[PDB]
Design a protein around this nucleic acid. Structure first.
Length: 749
RNA sequence: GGAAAUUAGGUGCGCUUGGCGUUUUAGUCCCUGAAAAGGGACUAAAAUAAAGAGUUUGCGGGACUCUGCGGGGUUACAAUCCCCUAAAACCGC
DNA sequence: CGGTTTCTGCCAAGCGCACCTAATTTCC
DNA sequence: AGAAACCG
């Protein structure tokens, strides 16, 4: 029993090998994807949803304020049946002209309302900073300079751009930005000044407002929420995992980092120059830090010796910029808790409420609220309370930890199977779904091997991107149980050693262009015609993609006239909408999103096959389609076929479902991965499991007639008259199993 | 390899915003034309995934908040099952 | 039918957290 | 990447 498991962990593949008694036993490749930011599109759409939802409510708020103050109708500022709102109908004067009149004459309250809503809808960039400047930062500065020759942004836009002609042109120039240019961007503070200036000048012309109307219009139109609470994202202490990390800008953390730098420098001079320093020498460097939160290198040298060069750089040995600001603004638990509140609560109002709980006057709360702290140490307050008293006595960090019996938290209970990565203390270190997914597949393949072959002695991982292998190594050695060697189980293999051994063994140019090369790398890690016999036995494993969520439709909004030629006038467009070939959302025609599923039926008497396509929008609507695609002529839409009692549900197909198909041209069926269903031709796109072009057989060359060295893909395979069309299942290890019948899965709502 | 610290650069995840673009309803200006009918530039406003949910607080509201294109667990497979994945304020009574 | 082509939303500014990398210091 | 029209 010399049982070894080896893994080549890629960004899209898991190659594995199993050797017992120095003999190769099993082999396989797991391809789990074919795209390095998975959550990014979801986050952008989420950020965009909320920004516009808040803009709508903010504008709704201002429409309420003017409807009450000016005694106007609220619904006059809302659309009625996708038609322009009543307050904006008829021959309209532009808001740019109105914003210019506001500086010279009295506006009617109808005009003033449209002035407020125009400035509020696009209120400008919030230049909070006021270091290479980007496109928008350069524009707001360029517009700020030209703005000095005018009373307001409105007069500037109205006189320089509004309906002004370009040079030697019959065409108006643009006031808004056009076509990837940011030339018109103006800082938000100037548009607040204009609205305040408009209110002031409108008062002088005889416009009277309520006491709180201007105050509410100004605050609402320019309200901006602070950062949402993110305290749950802060990591935990490496000693007391139930504690949060301490903020860097706290009195304890200031003391701890200071003592760390000072004590380590004094001991560095003892090991390199032989000078032993007193505890008073420590208090000299410390008192210089505690005075101004600063300590220059020349003063460290002066306080103990000559102008000499350590292994250092810069002017400061200790630099706490926020220390002086914190002390000028002001129990030790209260100081440390207050610094935590400043670091977390970015909402100044909520921060004042938290600081009001402590015995501090209002002059201190306001000065403490204006402070900006960030960053954390890797240990907690609870740990700092224990270690800093010992380090004040001159003891090094390790000596203080040994004296307090502080050891880092390391898992002690090991399991037969590798537990979920989400249940380990390594979880909080990984937020990237790409890494999380690659770890997930490593776990799935490993536990499958352990279930099939039992416990193992050693596991070898290829380390190349490199820290992920180091992470997987510590993951496995901390949580997985092994067989004993006698009476280290997880080893890393150098990637530079793999490429050299690949040439030594002769596998350097074997299968570089197909999926099987991830396994030959795993076999080398586990340690010539005997191993290649096991490589040819490999069936590459891919998971079916059953995820029903995703973009519900394409993002391009389209006029229905675009489909008149293809579908057959507006008659055909309505038919396409009823069939799900296109969707209408918010009165806008859009194409389908992903076809995540297709349901295959078979006619009970004719044995013809039929396909029902199922898109992300159908799952969102929670209505299961039930009409099979029928081919249509060029400019028309033939009726689709209702799947009534004459048709028999066979199975559901997802991307990378394994199927066994045989066309009439084929003498035998072949295993292939389903890739897509083309609705216009009622046909399939399928690919070979290993994407290996060289080993193509006679029967496979009939199917993959247009295959090449890069991809073995067959397209436009009609389903209707398929000889064989069956569904199979692929395990994580590449074991193929006939798919037992399962009833059609419905949508529930 | 492991623990702590410092500086610099970077990746991802998360949050708060800005500007486009598109679709829709109108308007402004100009241009061709006998007319009918067109064309262009520009401005405004609405919409910008389908659709849902919710405590603080007895009830209601939106001039409140949140979910809605990601990941994990489960397994002839990985999903619509189970987790990551809520919580206050304001107005009226 | 079946092989091939067409067409897909985008950028900017700044603030947080988790990490990575490159140096450097103390310890095991 | 992936839906689906195009085209002979």
């Amino acid at each position: 029993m010399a049982r070894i498991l080896a893994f080549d962990i890629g960004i899209s593949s898991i190659g594995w090998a199993f050797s017992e008694n120095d003999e190769l036993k099993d082999c396989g490749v797991r391809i789990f994807t074919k795209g390095e930011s998975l959550a990014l599109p979801r986050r952008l759409a989420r950020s965009a949803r909320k920004r516009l939802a808040r803009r709508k409510a903010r504008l709704n708020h201002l429409k309420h304020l003017i409807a009450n103050e000016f005694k106007l109708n609220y619904e006059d500022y809302q659309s009625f049946d996708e038609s322009l709102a009543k307050a904006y109908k008829g021959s309209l004067i532009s808001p740019y002209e109105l914003r210019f009149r506001a500086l010279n004459e009295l506006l009617s309250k109808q005009d003033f309302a449209r002035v407020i809503l125009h400035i509020a809808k696009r209120r400008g960039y919030d230049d909070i900073k006021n270091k290479e400047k980007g496109a928008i930062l350069k524009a707001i500065k360029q517009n700020e300079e030209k703005l000095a020759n005018y009373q307001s942004v409105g007069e500037y836009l109205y006189k320089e751009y509004f309906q002004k002609f370009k040079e030697n042109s019959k065409e108006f120039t643009n006031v808004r930005n056009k076509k990837e240019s940011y030339e018109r961007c103006i800082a938000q503070s100037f548009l607040k000044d204009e609205l305040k200036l408009i209110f002031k000048k409108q008062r002088e012309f005889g416009f009277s407002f309520s006491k709180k109307f201007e105050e509410e219009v100004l605050s609402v139109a320019f309200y901006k929420r602070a950062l949402k609470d993110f305290s749950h994202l802060v990591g935990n202490c490496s000693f007391f995992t139930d504690e949060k990390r301490a903020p860097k800008n706290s009195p304890l953390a200031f003391m701890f980092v200071a003592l760390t730098r000072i004590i380590n420098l004094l001991n560095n001079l003892k090991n390199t120059e032989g000078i032993l320093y007193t505890k008073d020498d420590l208090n000299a460097l410390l008192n210089e830090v505690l005075k101004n939160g600063t300590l220059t290198y020349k003063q460290t040298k002066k306080l103990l010796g000559l102008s000499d060069d350590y292994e250092f750089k810069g002017e400061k040995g200790t630099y706490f910029i926020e220390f002086k600001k914190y002390k000028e603004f002001i129990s030790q638990d209260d100081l440390n808790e207050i610094a935590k509140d400043i670091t977390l609560i970015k909402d100044e109002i909520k921060l004042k409420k938290a600081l009001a709980k402590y015995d501090l006057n209002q002059n201190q709360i306001d000065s403490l609220s204006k402070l900006e702290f960030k960053d954390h140490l890797n240990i907690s307050f609870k740990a700092l309370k224990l270690v800093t008293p010992l380090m004040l006595e001159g003891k090094k960090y390790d000596e203080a930890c040994n004296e307090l019996n502080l050891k880092v938290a390391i898992n002690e209970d090991k399991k037969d199977f590798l537990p979920a990565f989400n249940e380990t203390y390594y979880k909080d270190e990984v937020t990237n779904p790409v890494v999380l997914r690659a770890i997930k597949e490593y776990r799935k393949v490993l536990n499958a091997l352990l279930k099939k072959y039992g416990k193992v002695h050693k596991i070898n991982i290829e380390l190349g991107g490199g820290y992920i292998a180091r992470l997987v190594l510590n993951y496995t050695k901390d949580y997985l149980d092994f067989l004993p060697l006698s009476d280290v189980h997880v080893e890393a293999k150098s990637g530079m050693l793999t490429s050299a051994l690949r040439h030594t063994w002769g596998f350097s140019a074997k299968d570089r262009n197909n999926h099987l090369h991830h396994a030959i790398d795993a076999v080398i890690i586990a340690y010539r015609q005997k191993v290649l016999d096991k490589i040819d036995e490999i069936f590459v494993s891919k998971p079916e993609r059953k995820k029903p969520s995703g973009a519900l439709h394409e993002e391009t909004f389209r006029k229905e006239e675009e489909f008149y030629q293809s579908y057959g006038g507006k008659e055909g467009v309505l038919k396409a909408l009823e069939l799900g070939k296109i969707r209408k959302v918010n009165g806008k025609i859009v194409k389908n999103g992903d076809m995540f599923r297709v349901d295959i039926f078979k006619h009970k008497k004719t044995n013809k096959f039929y396909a029902v396509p199922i898109y992300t929008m159908d799952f969102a609507l929670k209505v299961l389609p039930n009409k099979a695609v029928a081919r249509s002529k060029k400019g028309e839409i033939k009726d689709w076929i209702l799947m009534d009692e004459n048709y028999e549900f066979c199975f559901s197909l997802y991307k990378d479902s394994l199927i066994l198909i045989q066309t009439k041209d084929m003498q035998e069926p072949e295993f292939v991965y389903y890739n897509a269903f083309t609705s216009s031709t009622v046909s399939l796109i399928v690919s070979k499991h290993d994407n290996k072009f060289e080993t193509l057989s006679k029967n496979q060359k009939i199917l993959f007639k247009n295959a090449n060295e890069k991809e073995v893909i067959a397209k436009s395979i009609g389903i209707q008259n398929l000889k064989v069309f069956e569904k199979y299942i692929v395990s994580a290890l590449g074991e193929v199993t006939k798919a037992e019948f399962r009833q059609r899965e419905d949508f529930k709502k």
